[PDB]
Amino acid sequence: TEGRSRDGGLRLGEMERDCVIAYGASQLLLERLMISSDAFEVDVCDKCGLMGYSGWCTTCKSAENIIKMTIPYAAKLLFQELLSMNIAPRLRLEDIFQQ
């Protein structure tokens, strides 16, 4: 929340984001902006870059290609808002490993 009477948090603006980038602290960026603000474990289908629920793609109705990852709830909200308009921001995934 955004008020002292509401037990609000301190906003880390674009300026502080810029400063942390200039430091080169990627993990601190991740922790301040994703872990400690809004971390959401979304379900993303590998076949269609569309978010699923409860391990179910509910667009191909297969649950086979559903992958689990954490993204900002702001990003999840933005994707669900973009799908409300005629934009389909399909997420393509790749493994961090296998080099």
Binding site: I21, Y23, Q27, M34, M85
Partner: protein
């Protein structure tokens, strides 16, 4: 470095970035997003702005390399072992 003087103005930022997330975060969100959706743009997630928006690790600073733990496994304990029936069956032909 593009061969022409490109500004830091909104029009200038549309130089080669192709990052619709970074452009929309900067300015003119809706028109850029709709043009990207209409053109079927396929922008990758490579910039720090997009990485922050998506919750990824940037390729800058502590994210510009990879930490790897050596397995310290010898080559004597990796070859297959205890296999003779296949040799017997092959010699049988």
């Amino acid at each position: 470095y593009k061969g022409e003087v490109l500004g830091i103005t909104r029009f200038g930022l549309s130089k080669m970035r192709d990052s619709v997330l970074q452009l929309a975060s900067f300015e003119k969100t809706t028109d850029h997003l709709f043009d990207a959706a209409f053109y079927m743009k396929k922008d990758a997630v490579e910039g720090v702005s997009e990485c922050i928006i998506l919750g990824q690790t940037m390729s800058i600073g502590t994210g510009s390399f990879k930490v790897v733990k050596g397995t310290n496994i010898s080559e004597k304990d990796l070859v297959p072992k205890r296999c003779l029936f296949e040799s017997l069956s092959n010699e049988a032909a």
